[PDB]
């Protein structure tokens, strides 16, 4: 009948290396559903004007972490028919990094946030971060 699917929605800071127009980290409104990440400039522009969307299934997920430096970065390496796209996500705190990273790591494997091991994945990441500090 009625079902409910989990999503992530928040503002993240994003950098795109190989976009040959100059642009560093911008705060965008970013939404994660199923195994696809979509980022937008503004909330009003959600959901049907995607500045960028990408299916993370099959991609490389590179953690880029320095807890003492308040660096919570996720590097997504997405293959394409014309080479690799890179998408760098910077989160605001440890909780946000844990949710967003758990989601990216599962999605890379084709598993969604509905998979029963997503919660233990978040909590596992939080533990990781908390013990480094």
Residue numbers in the entry: 345 to 477
Study authors write:
Similar to that of kindlin-1 and -2, the PH domain of kindlin-3 contains an additional C-terminal amphipathic helix extension, which is not present in other PH domains. A salt bridge in the kindlin-1 PH domain (Arg380–Glu416) has been shown to occlude its canonical phosphoinositol-binding site, and in the kindlin-3 PH domain, this salt bridge is replaced by a hydrogen bond (Arg360–Gln396) in the equivalent position. The kindlin-3 PH domain has a mixed surface charge distribution with a pronounced concentration of positive charge at the canonical inositol phosphate-binding site. The kindlin-3 PH domain is closest in structure to the PH domain of kindlin-2 (RMSD = 0.69 Å), with the major conformational difference being in the β1–β2 loop. In particular, the β1–β2 loop is flexible with both simulation force fields, in good agreement with the crystal structure. MD simulation revealed that kindlin-3 PH domain interacts with the PIP lipids primarily via the loop connecting the β1 and β2 strands, and that it has a somewhat higher affinity for binding PtdIns(3,4,5)P3 than for PtdIns(4,5)P2 in a membrane-like system. Moreover, one kindlin-3 PH domain appears to bind multiple inositol phosphate lipids, at both canonical and non-canonical sites, by means of which the affinity of interaction between the PH domain and the membrane is greatly enhanced by an avidity effect.
The later identification of the kindlin family of proteins revealed them to be key co-activators of integrins, alongside talin. Talin and kindlin interact directly with the cytoplasmic tails of integrin β-subunits, with kindlin binding to a membrane-distal NPxY motif and talin binding to a membrane-proximal NPxY motif.
